[PDB]
Curated annotation (Swiss-Prot), chain A:
Localization per Swiss-Prot or TrEMBL: Secreted
Phenotypic consequence of residue 131 to V: Great increase in thermostability
Protein residues bound to Na(+): 159
Binding site for Ca(2+) 2: 159, 179
Effect ascribed to mutating residue 131 to I/V: Increase in thermostability
Effect caused by changing residue 131 to P: Great decrease in thermostability
Name the UniProt record assigns to this protein: Alpha-amylase
Outcome, altering residue 162 to A/C/E/H/R: Loss of activity
Location of this fragment in the whole protein: 32 to 210 of 512
Organism name: Bacillus licheniformis
Family recorded in the similarity comment: Belongs to the glycosyl hydrolase 13 family.
Outcome when changing residue 144 to X: No effect on thermostability
Subunit details: Monomer.
Swiss-Prot record, chain B:
Listed EC numbers: 3.2.1.1
Required cofactor(s): Ca(2+); Na(+)
Biotech use: Used in the food industry for high temperature liquefaction of starch-containing mashes and in the detergent industry to remove starch. Sold under the name Termamyl by Novozymes.
Top enzyme class: hydrolase
Protein family membership: Belongs to the glycosyl hydrolase 13 family.
Subunit-level organization: Monomer.
UniProt binding sites for Na(+): 2, 8
Source organism of this protein record: Bacillus licheniformis
Subcellular location: Secreted
Gene: amyS
Domain of life per record: Bacteria
The protein's name in its UniProt record: Alpha-amylase
Biological classification of the source: Bacteria, Bacillati, Bacillota, Bacilli, Bacillales
Length: 179, 290
């Protein structure tokens, strides 16, 4: 039969932690209407419970640890997600996870980093000399610790940011000192 | 403005590349995922993405279908990306979405014949994920460019009943969007279900395109022996309604077909030679099946 995919989320859905249950309940309908695959929204912890999922704070926290003031994500907990996926699988529907890896949001703390400013038009052309700024680049995941992964983030794992916390300035920064 | 405080991941850093590759496999295994949707690939190192997709499939031994969101209304940029990534994954057909949007906002003035060119599906049918609207194009979103509701079912018939492309149905279109503008997408569920049915049990066999008119365009599927009663004749119109004689395959001559969308009550009988004269109402869509 023809394969048909469905994006199973919308931007303004309610933050009631019931999305995974909704999907689990929707498996029969999806199957009878020919959906063979569903793309689910980012399942990992965002910068807050209400984050649609593109804030991307912790990739190993699929609504499992208490971080960002909540255990579950906007959509639900890891268990509900797992139950939903099992229903889909029992009906031969595939599940495509969203991968948000261009940035990280919601750093646990700032770090003093050396940066230069770049041209907003030509984001390469440096329009400033190096100077210390405070950037939200430290990720240690206090709620999770080292469960699943002990990797911690620091300014050098990044290229830059658009906010200097010290001066509270919005400029385009590129971390020096080998970032 | 919280996004201003996010940090851009550096993929030139060996540990970062090794870490994302490893997480990738963990994500896949923890959730038993069957594939991925790659976000914002335009700002990420192309070679890394190509390697990450290869890595994950290798470590899992699974097919791992992958579709990347390279948001560029330009076939040239998308094609380059496909080349730089070794065609190891598909991309969303951004150009096609933009034409759907253009057609819907020009009230019949659009040249429907244009739909056939400048799209990923036109060039790379096997590397295109076609969609009508998504969470960034819906009312009030960053890339807002919603396909007007009246045109919506025509856009769906296009991506769901044609042979090319891996079509994607949108949750917001099915159940409506819950934003707070006076332009929210309503639940078109009742209007897309018949089109989904057509794709499911009728969109099979050879295809015949009839994009020979500024407004009324259509296509057929001869059906295939493996699927019983398969075969269809789709007609969509930008402006004024009308009719078109279309070939559905001499194989189903003498059959009486009916508009599965119900927009038309009149049956169409296929002649001895496999031809039919199908009808469509203005600013409407008609999908005749047996």
């Amino acid at each position: 039969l023809n394969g048909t995919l469905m994006q199973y989320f919308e931007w303004y859905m309610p933050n009631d932690g019931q999305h995974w249950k909704r999907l689990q309940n929707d498996s029969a309908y999806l199957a009878e209407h020919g959906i063979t695959a569903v793309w689910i929204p980012p399942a990992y912890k965002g910068t807050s419970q209400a984050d649609v999922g593109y804030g991307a704070y912790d990739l190993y926290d699929l609504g499992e640890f208490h971080q960002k003031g909540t255990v579950r994500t906007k959509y639900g907990t890891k268990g509900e997600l797992q139950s939903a996926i099992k229903s889909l699988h029992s009906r031969d529907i595939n599940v495509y996870g969203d991968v948000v890896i261009n940035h990280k949001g919601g750093a646990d703390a700032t770090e003093d980093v050396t940066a230069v400013e770049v041209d907003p038009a030509d984001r390469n052309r440096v329009i400033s000399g190096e100077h210390l700024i405070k950037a939200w680049t430290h990720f240690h995941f206090p709620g999770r610790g080292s469960t699943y992964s002990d990797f911690k983030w620091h300014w050098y794992h990044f290229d830059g940011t658009d906010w200097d916390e010290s001066r509270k300035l919005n400029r385009i920064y590129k971390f020096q000192g080998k970032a | 403005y919280d996004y201003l405080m996010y940090a851009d991941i550096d993929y030139d850093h060996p540990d970062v590349a090794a870490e994302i590759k490893r997480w990738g496999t963990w994500y896949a295994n923890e959730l038993q995922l069957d594939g991925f949707r790659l976000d914002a690939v335009k700002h990420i190192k192309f070679s890394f993405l190509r390697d990450w997709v290869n890595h994950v499939r290798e470590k899992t031994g699974k097919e791992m279908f992958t579709v990347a969101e390279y948001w560029q209304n330009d076939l040239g940029a998308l094609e380059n990306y496909l080349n730089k990534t070794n065609f190891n994954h598909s991309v969303f057909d951004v150009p096609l979405h933009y034409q759907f949007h253009a057609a819907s906002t020009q009230g019949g003035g659009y040249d429907m014949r244009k739909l056939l060119n400048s799209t990923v599906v036109s060039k790379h049918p096997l590397k295109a994920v076609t969609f009508v609207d998504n969470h960034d194009t819906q009312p009030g979103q960053s890339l807002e460019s919603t396909v007007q509701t009246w045109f919506k079912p025509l856009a769906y018939a296009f991506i769901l009943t044609r042979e090319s492309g891996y079509p994607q149905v949108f949750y917001g279109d099915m159940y409506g969007t819950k934003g707070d503008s006076q332009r929210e997408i309503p639940a078109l569920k009742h209007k897309i279900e018949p089109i989904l049915k057509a794709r499911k049990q009728y969109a099979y066999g050879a295809q015949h395109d009839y994009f020979d008119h500024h407004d009324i365009v259509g296509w057929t599927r001869e059906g295939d022996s493996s699927v019983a009663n398969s075969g269809l004749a789709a007609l969509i119109t930008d402006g004024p309604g009308g009719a078109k004689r279309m070939y559905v395959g001499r194989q189903n001559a003498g059959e009486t077909w009916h508009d599965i969308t119900g927009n038309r009550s009149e049956p169409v009988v296929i002649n001895s030679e496999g031809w039919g004269e199908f009808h469509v109402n203005g600013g409407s869509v008609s999908i005749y099946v047996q």
